[PDB]
From a paper:
Family S46 peptidases are serine proteases showing dipeptidyl peptidase activity and are widely distributed in Bacteroidetes and Proteobacteria, but are not found in mammals. The SmDPP7 enzyme forms a homodimer, with each subunit consisting of 697 residues (Ala23-Ala719) and a molecular weight of approximately 155 kDa. Each subunit contains a catalytic double β-barrel domain harbouring the Asp-His-Ser catalytic triad (top domain) and an α-helical domain that caps the active site (bottom domain). SmDPP7 hydrolyses peptides from the N-terminus of oligopeptides, cleaving the dipeptide units (NH2-P2-P1-COOH) when the second P1 residue is a hydrophobic amino acid.
The unique features of the Val-Tyr complex are that the bottom space of the S2 subsite is occupied by four water molecules and the side chain of Lys206 is less ordered. In the Tyr-Tyr complex, one of the four water molecules at the bottom of the S2 subsite in the Val-Tyr complex is replaced by the hydroxy group of Tyr(P2) and the side chain of Lys206 is well ordered due to aliphatic contacts with the side chain of Tyr(P2). Because S46 peptidases involve conformational changes upon dipeptide binding, which reduce the degrees of freedom of the polypeptide chain, the transition from open to closed state is entropically unfavourable. For Val-Tyr, thermodynamic parameters were not determined due to low-avidity (Kd > 40 µM). The order of dissociation constants (Kd) of dipeptide (P2 a.a.; V > N > Y > L > F) was consistent with the result of competitive inhibition assay.
Author numbering:
A (entry chain A), B (entry chain B): 23 to 719
Amino acid sequence: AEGMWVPQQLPEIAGPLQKAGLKLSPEQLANLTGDPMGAVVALGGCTASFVSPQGLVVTNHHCAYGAIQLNSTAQKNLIKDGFNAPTLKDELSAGPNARVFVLDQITDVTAQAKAAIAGAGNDPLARSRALDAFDKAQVAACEADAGFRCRLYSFSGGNTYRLFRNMEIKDVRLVYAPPGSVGKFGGDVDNWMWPRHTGDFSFYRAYVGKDGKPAAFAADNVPYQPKHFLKFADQPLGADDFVMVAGYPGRTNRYALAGEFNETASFTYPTIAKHYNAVLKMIADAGKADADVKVKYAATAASMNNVAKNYLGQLEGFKRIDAAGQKQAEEAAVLAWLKKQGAAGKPALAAHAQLLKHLDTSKSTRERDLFVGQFNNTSAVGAAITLYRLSIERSKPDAEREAGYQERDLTTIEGGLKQMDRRYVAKMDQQLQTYWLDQYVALPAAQRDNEVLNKWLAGSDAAAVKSLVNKLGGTELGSLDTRLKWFKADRAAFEASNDPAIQYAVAVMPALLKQEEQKKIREGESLTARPLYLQAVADYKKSQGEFVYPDANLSLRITFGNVMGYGKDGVKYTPFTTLEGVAAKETGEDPFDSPKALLDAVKAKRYGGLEDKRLGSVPVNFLSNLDITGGNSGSPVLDANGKLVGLAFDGNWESVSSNWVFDPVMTRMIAVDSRYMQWIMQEVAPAPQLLKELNLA
Amino acid sequence: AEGMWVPQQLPEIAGPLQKAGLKLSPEQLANLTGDPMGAVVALGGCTASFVSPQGLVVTNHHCAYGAIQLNSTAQKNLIKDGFNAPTLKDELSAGPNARVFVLDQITDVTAQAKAAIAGAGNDPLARSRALDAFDKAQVAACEADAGFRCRLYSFSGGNTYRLFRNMEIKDVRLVYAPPGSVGKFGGDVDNWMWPRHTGDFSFYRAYVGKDGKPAAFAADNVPYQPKHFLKFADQPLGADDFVMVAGYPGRTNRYALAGEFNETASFTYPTIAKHYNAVLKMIADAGKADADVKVKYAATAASMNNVAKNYLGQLEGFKRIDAAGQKQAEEAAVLAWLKKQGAAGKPALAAHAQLLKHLDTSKSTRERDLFVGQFNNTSAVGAAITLYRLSIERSKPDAEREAGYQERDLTTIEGGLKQMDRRYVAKMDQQLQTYWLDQYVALPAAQRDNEVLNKWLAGSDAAAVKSLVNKLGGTELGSLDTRLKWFKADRAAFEASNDPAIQYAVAVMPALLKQEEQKKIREGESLTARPLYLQAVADYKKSQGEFVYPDANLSLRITFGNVMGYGKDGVKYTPFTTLEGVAAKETGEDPFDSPKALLDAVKAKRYGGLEDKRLGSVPVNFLSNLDITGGNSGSPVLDANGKLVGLAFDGNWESVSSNWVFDPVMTRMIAVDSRYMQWIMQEVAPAPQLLKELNLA
C-alpha cells in the first residue's frame, strides 16, 4: 500500500491492515514500546530491530557497513571476509558514533510550537530563532533524565510537531557480518535492481553500563536487555502474504513544489551523479595503488555509488511517469481548486506565491556552491571548519549554541574526529581537494567569485590548484591527537594558528555564518507559508480521495502490503529469488563471486530444511508493494503475526522516483528473506552461537 | 524443440512436429520446391521469403541494412528515414552483390565425394585439391544452365556431402524499410535482449530479365514470379501455438572439440570483443565528426556491435551453463565409450589426437594472425590483395583457379569493389589501419615475425605506424574507377604499379600463399579425422538418446516448437511484447526515439484492427523455443498451417551460448509479429501498395 503512515494514523489504516491480512490486532501496533513495535529501533539513517533478550540487533549489511569498515584493515578486511563473534568478548565496537535509539515516548507539542513561532510575529529570523529555542527547550526538559535523547520532528511542512524521546544506546558492537560477496552480492551492478540475490544482513549487540544506563564503550559494559524483541517467522512467507514494515524513512518530497522538483531533476541529480562517478573512479584508482585507501574510503565509495546510481534511477524514473507533468498538473489543480474555495482559499494561494519566489536564488551560483561545499567537506578542511565552529560556539551559553554544537553534541563531534582516523588518507584527501578545486577553477570567471578561495588559489589553473593543495598538505589535522587538542581549544588559538587548514577555516567562517543566517531566514519565511500550502495540498489530495500521510522526516512510520512482483511489457518479476539464482549469476569475479561454501551448498541442494515447497528452494530476496525510502534500510518485515520474515534493504529500479511521485504499479521494496539469513548462517558463513541465541539451531 | 534439422530428417521429427501442433503434413514440408518451403529463400548470410506472386520478399531490416546503407547519403539517410517504393520504378537496387537464392535441387553426393578424397591417397594437400577439384566439377556442371548457382555442403564433419542447386536472382531491389527507429528500435542496448520492441522487417523485390532468366540490374527487368510465396496468417498467434522456421543458419559449433571451445572462450571471443569495442568507439567518434563517415561505416558498425555483444553474451552463457564442464564431460565420455567399443572405436580415437594437433598450430601465432588478418582486410589493403590475387588466378586456367577467384566469382568481386564506393572514407580506413597496426607493433618482438609488415613498418611504435599509414595513404584504390581498372589488369600490371597498397599486396602475397597451402595441408589432414571423430560423437550421442543433427553449415534447416517465454530466477519472460512496450521505452534519444506517428498511434490506441484480445494490444515481438543462429535472420515463422506469423531476427541474451552448448531452458528465438509489420505499414510508415499486394487491404 502507498503511505508512510505515522503511528497516530493507525486508526485510519486499521481496516486496510486487517483487509491486507494483518492477524494481530491493530491496537497491538498502537503500543510503540510493546510487542512488536518496541523491538524496532533507529540507528540514525538506518532501522534495526531487537531479535534477542540479550540486545542482539539485526540490520542490513550496508547499514553495518560503516561499523565493519571501521574495524577493517587492508590485511584483515571484514568487508571482504565475514565477521563472527563466537563470544560476547569477541564483539567489536561499531565505533564511538554508533547508536541504537529505543523509542520511549511521542508527545504532540504542535500548539506550543505554533505559539512559540507566532510569538515572533512577522520577523523571519525571529521565527527561526523562536522555533530553535522551542526545540532546545523541549529537548533539554526531555533529556533531563540520563540515557534519553529527544528529537523534535516537524510533520506536513510544520502543521504538526512531535517530540520523540529515545533511550540512546552508545555502545553498539558488531556480532556478525556475512562476507561482502553475500552482504553486497552483485555490488553496484545489482544495486537498485531486481532480480536481487543479496544477503544484506548483519548483527549488532546493544550494551549499557553495569548501572543499566547508556555508556560509551567499556570492557565492563553488559548487553542491553530489551523489553521486546522480534521472533523469526515459523510460517513460510509466500506470494500474496501480508507484510508490514516499521522504520525511520529519512526524507520524501511528494509534497514538493513543481519548481523544487524541476531544480532537482535538471541540476542536482545529474550534476551530483556526474561528479560522484568522477570521484569514484579516482578513489577506485587510489585503492588499487594502496589497499589501505580502498579500506579507509570503502564507506564513502559505497555511499557515493549508491547515491549516484539512485540519482540516475530517479532521472529515468521521472521520464517513465512524466513526473514534471504530474507535478505541474497537481500544482495547477491545487491552485485552481484553491480559487473556487472563496474566502478561506486566499491564505494558501499567498503561501504558494511566497514558496515560489524561494526557487529564484541559486541559478549562476549552484555549481560554485556544490564545488566549494564539496571542497569545504573534504576531511582536513571539514575538520578545521567543524573544530573552529565549535570554538566559536563554546564562547556562547549552551542554549544559544548552534544545534550540532551544544554540550549534548560534544561526544558526537569528538566521535567524528576519532572515526576520521579510519576514514582519512592524506594522499586521497589531497586528490579530493584537487578534484573539487579543479571544478571551481574551471567555472566561468564571473562564477569563480569566492573571495577567500580566490585569495588562497592566487590563480585559476592546475598549478594554482597544485600549489594550494601543497599548502593545505602542511596541515597537522591528519593526526587524531592534533584534532582532539583543537576539539578542546579556545577560538584565539584557532585565529592565531599557522596550520593552513585552520587558517582557511578562520577565513571562510564569516561567509559560512552569513550563508547559515540566510538559510535560517529562508526557514523562518516558510515556517507559516509551507504549513498553509501543504495543508491545502493535503485538503486537496483528501478531496480527490488520494492517500494523505506526511513526507518522511526520519520519524517512525508503518507501511504494509503484500508480497508481490511487478510487470513491464514482456516481463513478469516473480516475488522471490532463490539459491539457484545466486549460483546462476556466479562469474568468479567481483561483484559476482559467492563463497565456495555457498556454490557447494547450492550445487548439493543443501537447503538446511529452509526450502519453501512453492519455490522448490530457499528464497533469497522478495518483492512487496510496501512504501519505504532511505532510512528504512534494516527495517524488519513482519508477517500477519508480527514475526520477522525479512529485512527491507532496497527498491527496484522503478521505485527510486517514488521519492517525488509515488507509482503503485512498479514501486517495490526488496527484502532479504529471514530464511536466507538463517541459511547463510548455517551453510555458508556459520554463526552457530547466533542461531542458538535466535532459537533457530 | 532442439535441433537444426536437415529436410532429410523430416521422418525423425514428424512425430515431434505433430506433438508440437503442426497441422500441415510433414511430407508437405519434405517438398522443398513446393508450398510453403519453396517460398523460403537464401539471401547469402540471411533468410527471406517470397510473399507475393510478383516476387515480393520479406526479410529483416538488419538483413536489408546493407542495401538501405548503400542507398543512403548524409543528406538522404534511408537508414534514419525509412524507404517506400510506391511503384515498381521507385524500387532501389539493393546493390550488385544482393542475391535471392531459390532452392531448385538437393542431391546427396556423399559416396562420390569420399571416393575423390580416398582416391588421392595419403598426401593431405593432395586430398584438399581432390575435394576442391570434385567440388568445382559438381558445381561447374550443376551451374551449366544460365540462371543457376550451386554449392557443395559438408555435413557432420564430412560424413555427408550434398549439392544445393539454386536459381540465383541477381537483381534485388529495396521496396520498403521502416525508419531505423522502428527497424532497429533499441539499437545496441536491446540487441540480443528480451523484452524486445523492434520492427525488424523490410521488403525486397526479386527481378529477372524479360526472358525470365536471372540478370544484373537493368531498368528493363521485370519482377520474378515465384512458383510459391507465403500468405500472412489469418489465425492470430498466441502463447503455446506451434511455430516453425525454415532458414539457412550459418555455423554452430556443438560438435567442436573441448579444446576448440576452450580456445574460443579463453582467447577468440574476449579478444575480438575487446578490439571490436575499441574500433567501434573510433568509428562512433569519426561518425560524430563526419556524417559522411557515419553513413558509409554504418553497416560495419552494426555488424561489429552485433558480433562484439554476441561474444560477450556467449562468454556469460558459458559460465551460466558451465559450457567448459559440459564440453570436457562429453568429450571425456566419448573417449571412454570409444575404449568400450574395440575395433569399432580405434579409428575415432586415432582421429581425435590428429584434430588436437591442428589447435596447437593456430595457438602460436593467433594474436599476430588476428591483427594482420584485420589489417589485410582494411578497405584499400583488402582490395589490393583481392585484386592482385585475382590477376594471379587469371594467369591460370579456370578449373585450377582458387574457390572465389573463378569465372563464376568475377561478378561478386566486381560487386564488392562497387559497394566499397558507398563504404569507404580514406580517413576512417587510416584509423582502422592504425588501430590494427598499433595492436601488431605492441606484440612481443617474438610474435612480430610478419617479415613484409616489419620491413614496411621500419619501427614498432605509434610513429612507425603513423608513417606506414601516411605511405599507404598515397593509394588510388579509394577511387572506384582505379579499382575497376585493377579488376581488369594482368599480373604484370600489378607488379609494375607504384600504388603503395598494390606494392603491399605484391610484397605479402607469397607469404599469404604459403599460409594458404599450409592451411590446405591442415584441411587435408582434417578431411578424414573430422568425419571419424564426429561420427563417434554422433554415435555416443544417439546411444544416450540425445538429439542428433549436423552443426549448421549455411544449408536449409527446419526448427520447430511453440510460442513461449522463459524463466530466470525472479523473472518470468512473457511470450509477447506489445505497442505500449514500445511507447514505454521512448526517450526521444537514439536508440529509443520512435517516429512521432508511432507514439501518436499508440497513445490513441489506433490498433488498426490488429489487436490480439489475449494481449489487449497489437503484438510487437514474440518468443519461441526454436533453435536458430546467424543466418536465420529474416526466416519466416510459419504457424501450424504454414502461414507467416513473423520473422526470426534474434535470440535472448541466454540463447547465444547455444552455439556451443544448447540450453533448452533459456534458448528462445525472438521474432517480429506479422501483425506489428502490418501495423507499422498501416499506422506509422505507410506502405499501402504493400498492404494491397500482401492481401491485407
